[PDB]
Amino acid sequence: EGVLYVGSKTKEGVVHDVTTVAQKTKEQVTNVGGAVVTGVTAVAQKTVEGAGSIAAATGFVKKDQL
Amino acid sequence: EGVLYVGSKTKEGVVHDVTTVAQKTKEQVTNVGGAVVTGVTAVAQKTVEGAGSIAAATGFVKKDQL
Amino acid sequence: EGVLYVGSKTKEGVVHDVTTVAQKTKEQVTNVGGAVVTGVTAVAQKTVEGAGSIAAATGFVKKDQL
Structure with a gap:
């Protein structure tokens, strides 16, 4: 079992x-x-796990x- | 079992x-x-898991x- | 079993x-x-799993x- x-x-998860x-x-x-966001924003993530969580x-x- | x-x-999950x-x-x-968002926003993610979660x-x- | x-x-999940x-x-x-969103927004995701979750x-x- 596994990968x-x-x-x-x-x-x-790449930008x-x-x-x-x-x-x-x-x-x-x-x-x-x-x-107020005028600039560039780049967010890359593989895994986020939780109840009621905000990502990116x-x-x-x-x-x-x- | 697995990948x-x-x-x-x-x-x-790529941008x-x-x-x-x-x-x-x-x-x-x-x-x-x-x-207010005027700038570029690029978000890449593979997995988000949770009840009542906001992603990107x-x-x-x-x-x-x- | 698996992939x-x-x-x-x-x-x-690519942009x-x-x-x-x-x-x-x-x-x-x-x-x-x-x-108010005037800028470019690019969001790529593979998997989102949860009850009452907002993605992208x-x-x-x-x-x-x-």
């Missing part, structure tokens, strides 16, 4: 080529108690009341 | 070529207690009352 | 070529307690009252 890798090439070019003459960002949150406003 | 990889090339070009002369962003949330406003 | 990969090339060009002269974004939410406003 057997015999002479194998595996890419799992491996991202090219970005940005040209802005004038920019303004105003944020009051919130999430880029822009996230969690205001919960249980 | 056998004999001389195999596998790409699973591997993304090209972006952006040209803006003037920009403004105003955000009050919310999520880019713009997310969770205001829950259980 | 056998003998000399196989498999791409599963591997996305090209974007954007030209804006003037832009404004106003957001009050909500989700790009623009999401969850205001629940259980």
